[PDB]
Each structure stands twice: as C-alpha cells, then as structure tokens.
Design a protein around this ligand. Structure first.
Ligand SMILES: O=P(O)(O)C[C@H](O)Cn1cncn1
Ligand SMILES: O=P(O)(O)C[C@H](O)Cn1cncn1
Ligand SMILES: O=P(O)(O)C[C@H](O)Cn1cncn1
Ligand SMILES: O=P(O)(O)C[C@H](O)Cn1cncn1
Ligand SMILES: O=P(O)(O)C[C@H](O)Cn1cncn1
Ligand SMILES: O=P(O)(O)C[C@H](O)Cn1cncn1
Ligand SMILES: [Mn+2]
Ligand SMILES: [Mn+2]
Ligand SMILES: [Mn+2]
Ligand SMILES: [Mn+2]
Ligand SMILES: [Mn+2]
Ligand SMILES: [Mn+2]
Ligand SMILES: [Mn+2]
Ligand SMILES: [Mn+2]
Ligand SMILES: [Mn+2]
Ligand SMILES: [Mn+2]
Ligand SMILES: [Mn+2]
Ligand SMILES: [Mn+2]
Lengths: 185, 185, 185, 185, 185, 185
C-alpha cells in the first residue's frame, strides 16, 4: 500500500512517498529542520514509512515550503488508500507529554474539516514560525479529505504541545486506516 | 446471541429483535422515518442485526411511539446478554461528523443512569420533534440497566449532532459487550 | 465551456451540467422547491446555464439531497474551468434586497475556504430547513476549490437575506471566471 | 514478569510484589481497609496480581502508611518493566461509575508528572482522609517514572469518584505496558 | 508612461523605475527578500512593470532601507502620471486570501492620507519586522499624493494578511489610473 | 566527594562531573553559550567544581540538549551525596540583583518537587528560549530527589531575573549539603 506524489512549482520542489503498511523507518529531510523532528513521530508512533524530499525558498519565510509538503502528504495519503473498504475509518486518541494533553479525532471519509483549538504561548520554537502548525493540518485536511478535530486539554510549553499533537495524530491515523475490523468489505 | 421482545399496549404495537453478534444487516421500519435513518447507524457501525417493527399513533404527537421502541430495544438488549461473563463491560468512544464531536461512555452493569449535555439549536430536524433524542436514551437506559454519559464537544447542526451520537453510541456498544478480553470468565 | 457531472448514491441520484459562458436559461428541478427559486438567481443574474435534476429521499430530512446537489455543482464547476488561464480570478460584489446587504468575495484558486457570518432569525423559510444554506456553500467550496467570504451587513427577513446572497454570489462568480482581463495567458 | 520490593523504615514495614502479566487474583492487606477495596480494582480490572503487606503506625494519622505503600508499588512497577521494548507505552481510558466520569491518561516513559483535577466534596469516605488520594498517585508517579493526567468530568459522590479513578487507572495501565503492538522491538 | 527616480543618501542607494502601462514582468531586488515577494504582487496582479534596485544598511535594522524604497516608488508614480486627465481616479477593491479579507480604497488626487486598521499577531514574518508594513504605505502616500484606506475585515495569519493587502492595493491601483472612462479629458 | 555521570542518547552526548566540596573553578561548555554563563554562577557562588561537556542537536531547537544536561547534573548530585548523614539538609536564601529578588528554598530529601513562580517578560535572552529555565530545574529536581521552591519577589529584566535565581540556588545548595551541623550523624 504505497502512494507517491511528486509536485514542483516555481517556489518549491516536493517529492513525497508513503508506505501506509510499514515499520518505523524514516528518511525525510525538508528545508526546515524542525519538521524533520515532527515527521519522525508519525513514522515511529504511527508505524508509517514516510519519505519526504523538499527543496524550497527558505531565503524568504517558511510559509511556502510548509504548504507544499503538507499538500503532498495528503495527495499521497488519498492515493495510498483506494476505494475505502474494510477499514475502521474512525481514529481517536489522546497522548500526554509532560503536563500537556492533546485529543485528536479523525474521520477519513471524503469531507474535509479542521477544528483547531491549540494556543501556543511563544512565537518561535527553535526557528519554526509556530503559526504554521495549524496551517500544516489545514493543508493536510484539504487534500486527504478527512475531518480532523484537535483539542488542547492542558499544558504550557511550545515544544511539548506540538510534539503531543504529532504523537496523537499518528496513533489516531494507524487506528483508522491501518487496522481492520472483523468485517471483510 | 439473540433477544426478542414483543410489546403491545393501547397506543403502540412494537416488535423488536436484536442479534448482538452479527453483521451490518438492517430492516427496521418505525412509524416515523427519521428513526429509521438512525437505527441504520447502530447496524452498520455497531455491527448489530436489529429488527424493529412498530405501529403507533402518529395521528397525535410522536412521543408515545418513541418510548415504546426505545423501551423494547433495552429489554431485548438485557435479554441478549445473560449472566454477564467475559465481556469488556466498558465502552468509550468519540466520533466526529462535520464540525461536531460527541463523546459517549457507557457501563452496562445493572445500574441505570443517563447524563445528557447536548443542545440542539433547531426544534425539528425533518419532522422529528428533537426533544425526544434525550428521551430515546432515557428509555433505553432504564430497561437495559446501563450508565450512559453523552457529551457534546463541538458543532452546530441538528442533523450532524444527532448522527454523531448514534455513530458513537454504536461503536461504544460493540466495544463493551461484543468484544471480549483475554480472561475467560 | 461546459462541465457535466452525474452522481448517484444509495440516497440520491443527481444529474448536473453547467454552461459557464451562456445566457439566462434555467431548467433545474430539485426535490425541494425552494432551491429551484434560488438556482434561478444564479442563472439570470450570473448569466449561467445550469441544469440540475436530483431525485432523493425527502421522505426523511432534506439534508441528504442538499449536499449531493451542492457537491455536484462544484465538481461540474471545477470541470467547467480547465487550466486556469486568462481569467480575472477575483470576484467581489455586494447586492441589496429590501433592508438587507450581503457582501460576497471569492478567489477560485485551488484552496477551499468558507467564511459564513449570516444569522437568519426564523427556522423555516417555506419548508426549507434554513440551517442548510451554510451547508450548501460548504459543499460547493470543498469540490470547486475556492475561497469564499459571505458577510451580512444589514437586514432582518429570512427570504430577503437568502435571496440577497444568491444574487451577490452570482454576480461575483461571473466577475471572477466569466470576464477576462487584458492579458492573454 | 514480576517485581518485588521490600521496604522498612522506623514508621512502616512494607512488602510489595506485582505480577504484571497475570489474572484477577488479589491478596493485599494494608493497615487501613479502604485501600484494600481500591487495590482490588487494579487487580480485577487491570488484570494484575498485586500482593501488598504493610504494617504501620495507624495509631497516628494514616499519611505515613499511605506514602510507603504507594512508593513501593512504583519501585516494584519500575522493576517489573525492564528495558522498555515492544510495549504500546500509551494508556488512555475513561470509565463511568454512577454520574461520575474520570479520564486517566499515562505515558510510562522516564519522566514523572502528576496532573490532578479531582475535587471530592466530603472529608472522609469511611475513615480514609480523602486528601491522600492525590498523594497516593503523587508517590506512585515519582518512583515509577510516568506522566499521569487524571481529570474529573462529572459526578458528586466521594465513594463514586475515587472508585471511578481506580477503575480507569487500571484499564489504562494494562493498555500501556501489558498489551503489545505489531512491532517486535 | 514611465517614471524613473534615482535617490542616494548616506544610508541607502535606491534606483526605481515603473512602467504604469505594462505587463506582468518583475525584476526588483531589495536588500531584504520579503519585499521582493510583495513587489511581485503589484507586478502580476496590478499588471505594472516595476524595477527596484536598492543597496542599504541591513547591518542595522531594516527601517532605513524600507523608507527609501517606498519613498522612491511614490515619486516615480507621481512622475508616471502627468496632468491627471482621463483616468477613473477612484480605485476600490477587496481581495481574499485564506480566511483574510483586506479592503483597499484610494483616491490619487493631490492630498495625502493613510488610514491603517490592520493588526498583525506576530512580530516577524520570516525576518521582516512587521511594524514596517504601515510605514511602507505611509511613505508611499506622502510622495504620491493619494488618500488610502486599508481595512482588515477578517483573518489571523501574518503571511496571509500582508499578502492580501498587496493583492488588493495592486488591483485598486490599476483601476484608478490604468483604466480610463468614457470621457476624453 | 565527587560524582561523575556520562550519558549518551541518539540526540545528545553528555559528560558531567561535580566536586561538591571544592573551589570556584569552572570548565563547562554546553552547546548553547547562555548556560555557560549560568553554570559559572553555581561554581563561583556555590563554591562547586562543575565540569560539563555536552554535544547535541542545536540544528533544531535547544529543548533536547537542555534536558540531558540538567538530568545529568542531578544524577551526578545524587551520586555525589551518599547515605545522607551529618548535613544541614535545609537550604534557603534570597539574593538581589538590580531590582529583582528571587527566594529559593530546598530540601534534598528523597522526594522531588518543583514550585515555580517566575514570569519572564521577553521570549529570548540572547538566543536562549526562556521557557527552558523552568524545564532546567524540573529536570534537575526529578533525578536529584529534592523539593525546590523558587519565588520571584520583584524585578522586570530577563537577564536579571535568571541570574538572580542561579545565584540564590547556588548559595542555598552549599548551605544544605556542603555545610555541616554540630551533630556527627
Ligand atoms: O518522548 P521521548 O522521551 O521518546 C523523546 C522526545 O521526543 C524528546 N523530548 C523531550 N521533551 C520534548 N521532546
Ligand atoms: O457519514 P456518511 O458519509 O457515511 C453518510 C451520512 O450518514 C450522511 N450525512 C451527511 N451529512 C449528515 N449525514
Ligand atoms: O428581486 P425581484 O424584484 O426581481 C423578484 C424577487 O426575486 C422576489 N422577491 C420579493 N421579495 C423577495 N423576493
Ligand atoms: O462496580 P460494581 O457494581 O462491580 C461494585 C462496586 O465496586 C461497588 N459500588 C457500588 N457503588 C460504589 N461502589
Ligand atoms: O496566491 P497564490 O496561490 O497564487 C501563491 C501565494 O502567493 C503563496 N501563498 C500561499 N499562502 C500564502 N501565500
Ligand atoms: O553580578 P556581577 O556584578 O558580579 C556580574 C554579573 O554577573 C553581570 N551582570 C550585570 N548585569 C547582569 N549580569
Ligand atoms: Mn498559506
Ligand atoms: Mn522533541
Ligand atoms: Mn415520556
Ligand atoms: Mn444523515
Ligand atoms: Mn452534512
Ligand atoms: Mn424571492
Ligand atoms: Mn507526604
Ligand atoms: Mn465500592
Ligand atoms: Mn521612519
Ligand atoms: Mn506568499
Ligand atoms: Mn522536555
Ligand atoms: Mn550576567
């Protein structure tokens, strides 16, 4: 079960491929290094094999090369799934880091939606603009065709809240499409 | 594992049977057609085989023929279970529709309770009186002997909130009694 | 410039075709008659030729046969456009009815968004559920791939506010894609 | 998989052993009888085999013999686990009693934390000082090395809230370390 | 219709030329790269041919080399126009990006004014100081001799609000001076 | 009295050694230079001999290489102490910088706790993320096994508040364990 999408514009050049049924292998180098620590989380905890290579204009702000990565993961994930048959289709999970809880629920059925209730106190994490985290999941929703609710329940630390939502999105994505129920189709 | 209850009063005539271990088959025609769309949800997502035939006085308000359907599903579900042995007994699940989250938790152990926190903005959905949804689960609780907490977390659409709680009740009922733990009894 | 989409599920059967460059001709019969008065407005004021034939389950609530009409207009409108070249791409317009102003702005470039600020006082217009008007434009946005801002500026009348936003959406859709600028491509 | 810890000070004398992979057997007599009803819950619902023998100074307040029990369960649970390999590592669960919901989430990875949001109305349950329940889980966190979030969602009954958090901690501890994912190590 | 202004002080060295009647060609390299992405917008959407070469002291803050660019565009734009005859003279436009609306209105008649109602949440975009955007249009107003009202109507994203006002200023500047009415002079 | 801890993970490589009874000598180079100015303060004012060598991934945010330094100082400090005998065990001190008072109290007896009441106005000091100062003392508490209360009493300057708490922690750590009372053991 693999979907691979290449996509190149005048701003970015994005190469994306995902094995949906796989192991904790990860090779994914974007132009900004903080996404590389977050795409490790949906490889080791979601047990996906994700491969991202993106070259973009970080000479200017990082908004352009974060859209085109997140848009390409969704088109690869819509192409990874087929005619949706024999999957659980519902993924819900909550995951603590230190002091912080995120609850992530998702639907993976045609219709795109993003509910976003996180509030990050600081404006940069290391060098990541921190207003792009909602824009990562907004771009992932619009091409994958999924409903997604992300809710913060506790916690005040910028590196801890963003890493609690990428562990909880990974565990709730391998519960929806990766696992299978008792029915056949 | 089947329980079947017939029940007839001067107002209604209700025939109800449930296969608790079954597939996504559904034949259930009540006097009001909007329940028929909701009992489809606890057949396809709960993987139950539910059979409801009710004839009642919809010449007057629909309050009378909604009690006697919901009372008969519970007596059939108490008769579907036996001496409760080797079941998980706890069912919790949250399920998104577009913009709306419902969290449903349940207990299935003797004691009846209903906590209800939904707030529906409109007063009719198509023709369904919308004040009967809490009364559906109040009648189902009192005969099944279960604790039930239903909590709205987001969402403003009458057809979306009621369909998000009948998908989440179904997935949380096939987690409590249908699945079995590692112990035998 | 024509796009035609047929779409049939277990609930509805929808046939939709749009001439984007056309005249004020209109033949469009949905299962609910109040949409037929509103699709007249995007034919005579938008100068589109829209043809809708939908058969659906109005035996239950009208939510199901309003999605599948609005989803099919968008896929027809994405197929009416091609590689977007030589269009204005921006459509903004405000249109009064009696006492009521709606301001509609749109983008037609890939990314879907809906901003909705209307507040209708009553719950039915004639028989139309009135909570579906936002759901009409939510379904039209997700398949057409357009940003859409709809803002109420004045007015308290249910038939006047909904008819002021379907005149202003029509005039702002024939300004974006139908008219052409001085450039060639 | 067994860890056994003996620990004796001038105040208490505590003997603690836990089979982490086991059945619903329970023999655990502390000096105060209300802990004995609560350690039954993490034996039958968590499917652990816990053995506690503690003799302490209940001639004075029960604060001293509740620390040393809860400190010894954690050191036994850190010794029950080894090099943490091939476990789910995340345990989240919510469990109703009558009218009361507790949501318990946990992490079991090195770092200790306790978030506590319960509010018990009365000051004694039978004879248990009721300000020690947070101190039970504070002592269990500091030696086990786990993050733990405990959140009350409803309910006003002292015996019902404390028994809803010891059923939900047990089900969320046999989900984190007891169950195993599809990966090997 | 071309105006070209060279201007050099002890701090900056600015070379600016604008073809007002032209096409979507753009070669404009300032010392800070985020202006280069914004001056692309008034070339492709305004259909102007703008040429900016500025060398300045970005060894210190960027306030000095943003004034002298914006002051030189206005003197070039006052020299691009002549005795104002046969132009529309009024330019108003609103332009959505994702979630954000800016309404820009302008006058181009002698008298300088700037109304500014934007509120940007963050303090840097990539490396641009974000308090200079109002100072860009304040310097452009004082030399061009135009009234300018900029009003935010929605939106919370720093890169989206600033790019929605440079698309709407461009479309409202090619409506005022570039297009011509039915009168001759 | 020396404890030395080496610790290496996939992210960092930390070498830490502390002479608890020593002089004002300091050689400690972490990957981020602002910790090096703060570990000078617990060498000259605490009269400790601390040696830290850490190599970590400052290619991404500094959160990872600040945990593993602070975790290694605590394990070295627990190994510096032995069976705690003949020490004062209580350390309390308040220390002014310009306009700012911090009161630091500590316990060094088994049980870990951190109370943190500082509020820093800015978000970076030079390049240090400033949300990590509480996370420094949270990691130092969990491995050393000490209670620690840090309270701000006055002051508004980011470099002055953080340097007032590292002078007051040093003087309160050489009062607890370094000095000895009149008793022998
Ligand atoms: O969760 P872990 O312990 O497996 C490693 C984390 O990814 C690193 N971390 C520590 N604090 C925040 N992130
Ligand atoms: O959830 P689906 O997409 O399987 C079909 C829904 O039952 C129909 N629906 C669409 N909006 C509200 N209900
Ligand atoms: O706008 P008109 O006058 O062309 C006809 C309207 O469509 C009918 N109407 C009158 N009030 C509300 N709608
Ligand atoms: O939950 P049960 O019914 O298995 C027995 C309970 O432990 C006893 N109880 C009844 N109310 C509060 N506790
Ligand atoms: O508006 P577009 O899609 O033509 C390209 C934008 O300029 C890039 N962008 C995407 N988000 C914010 N800016
Ligand atoms: O406290 P001092 O004067 O010994 C030197 C300080 O460490 C340097 N300093 C001056 N302001 C803030 N820090
Ligand atoms: Mn964007
Ligand atoms: Mn991390
Ligand atoms: Mn009743
Ligand atoms: Mn439905
Ligand atoms: Mn819908
Ligand atoms: Mn009308
Ligand atoms: Mn205590
Ligand atoms: Mn009890
Ligand atoms: Mn200035
Ligand atoms: Mn841009
Ligand atoms: Mn951390
Ligand atoms: Mn200093």
């Amino acid at each position: 079960r693999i979907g691979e999408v290449k996509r190149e514009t005048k701003e970015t050049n994005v190469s994306v491929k995902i094995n949906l049924d796989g192991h904790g292998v990860s090779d994914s180098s974007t132009g900004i290094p903080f996404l590389d620590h977050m795409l490790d989380q949906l490889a080791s905890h979601g047990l996906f094999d994700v491969h991202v290579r993106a070259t973009g204009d970080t000479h200017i702000d990082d908004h352009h090369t974060n859209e085109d990565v997140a848009l390409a993961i969704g088109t690869a994930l819509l192409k990874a799934l087929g005619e949706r048959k024999g999957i659980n289709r519902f993924g819900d999970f909550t995951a603590p880091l230190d002091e912080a809880l995120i609850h992530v629920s998702l639907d993976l059925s045609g219709r795109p939606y993003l509910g976003y209730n996180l509030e990050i106190p600081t404006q940069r994490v290391g060098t990541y603009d921190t207003q792009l985290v909602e824009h990562f999941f907004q771009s992932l929703v619009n091409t994958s065709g999924m409903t997604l609710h992300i809710r913060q329940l506790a916690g005040k630390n910028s590196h801890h809240i963003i890493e609690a939502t990428f562990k909880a999105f990974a565990r709730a994505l391998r519960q929806a499409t990766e696992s299978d129920p008792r029915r056949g189709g």
